[PDB]
Design a protein around this ligand. Structure first.
Ligand SMILES: C[N+](C)(C)[C@@H](Cc1c[nH]c(=S)[nH]1)C(=O)O
Length: 265
């Protein structure tokens, strides 16, 4: 059977269940390998070697982490696809239609207190903030290392935690500034102030299905099926599905089932 992997986020579970249910509807055998610790850093090699068959990746993450390209070049999907096929024998099916990129968030009270609107504002007052993020945020060149080269933050403290504990650390006041994702249900849930990336540091993170070319060779129907999801999930749809899971307490499975029904797939 085809093994569908995801990163350990609610959004990735929704996408994984959408892929798994869609393939199961076409009688393709599926095994779920959800919430792989470390995300891409462990998904990418397992995909290359064949432990996994497909997952949903973001363009800018492949651009920096796997393709070894500099952030001085604009992320280019056609380049990503060509190099993935030539060097990795991997196929980007397409783009789902939405872009979940990095941002920075603080409490709205702190934003008003310190006149913080932009990333540079946060850096300017950073000695008054305890910043927290997931482990990989301090390792990827497109995350904290680049933010430090571009903005030179001097946070009072740094806290590394499991990716699913960040907002909880913010709620407990262990940290009072953190990295967020633009489609996170918790941005609205906690009424956070998301800062403006005034130097345009973070690239494009459009979500798309990455699948082994061997799997498409064995199952052309899987490619034909998965292309029906192309451009069917814009930013608002991803944000609402995540809201349905994290706020309305629906399971990722039920959210994916309802979405596929809505699409008529
Ligand atoms: C989707 N995203 C915002 C572009 C990040 C999120 C993420 C990074 N690492 C893990 S784990 N999750 C990514 O996958 O690079």
């Amino acid at each position: 059977p085809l093994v569908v992997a995801t990163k350990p986020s609610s959004e990735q579970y929704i996408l994984g269940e959408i892929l798994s249910l869609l393939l199961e509807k076409h009688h393709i055998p599926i095994k779920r390998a959800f919430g792989i610790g470390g995300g891409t850093m462990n998904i990418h090699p397992a995909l290359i070697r064949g432990d996994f068959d497909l997952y949903v990746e973001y363009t800018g993450t492949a651009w920096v982490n796997t393709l070894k390209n500099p952030l001085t070049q604009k992320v280019d999907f056609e380049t990503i696809k060509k190099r993935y096929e030539k060097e990795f024998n991997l196929l980007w099916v397409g783009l789902l239609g939405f872009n979940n990129t990095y941002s920075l968030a603080i409490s709205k009270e702190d934003a008003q207190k310190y006149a913080i609107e932009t990333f540079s504002d946060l850096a300017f007052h950073s000695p008054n903030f305890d910043f927290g993020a997931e482990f990989d945020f301090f390792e990827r060149e497109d995350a904290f290392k680049g933010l430090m080269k571009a903005y030179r933050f001097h946070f009072r403290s740094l806290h590394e935690m499991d990716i699913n504990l960040r907002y909880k650390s913010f709620e407990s006041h262990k940290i009072n500034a953190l990295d967020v994702f633009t489609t996170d249900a918790q941005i609205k849930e906690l009424d956070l102030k998301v800062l403006k990336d005034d130097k345009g540091f973070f690239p494009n993170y459009q979500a798309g299905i990455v699948i082994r070319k061997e799997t498409i060779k064995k199952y052309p129907e899987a490619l034909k099926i998965l292309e029906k999801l192309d451009s069917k999930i814009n930013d608002e749809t991803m944000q609402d599905l995540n809201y349905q899971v994290e706020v309305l307490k629906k399971s990722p499975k039920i959210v994916a089932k309802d979405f596929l029904e809505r699409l008529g797939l």
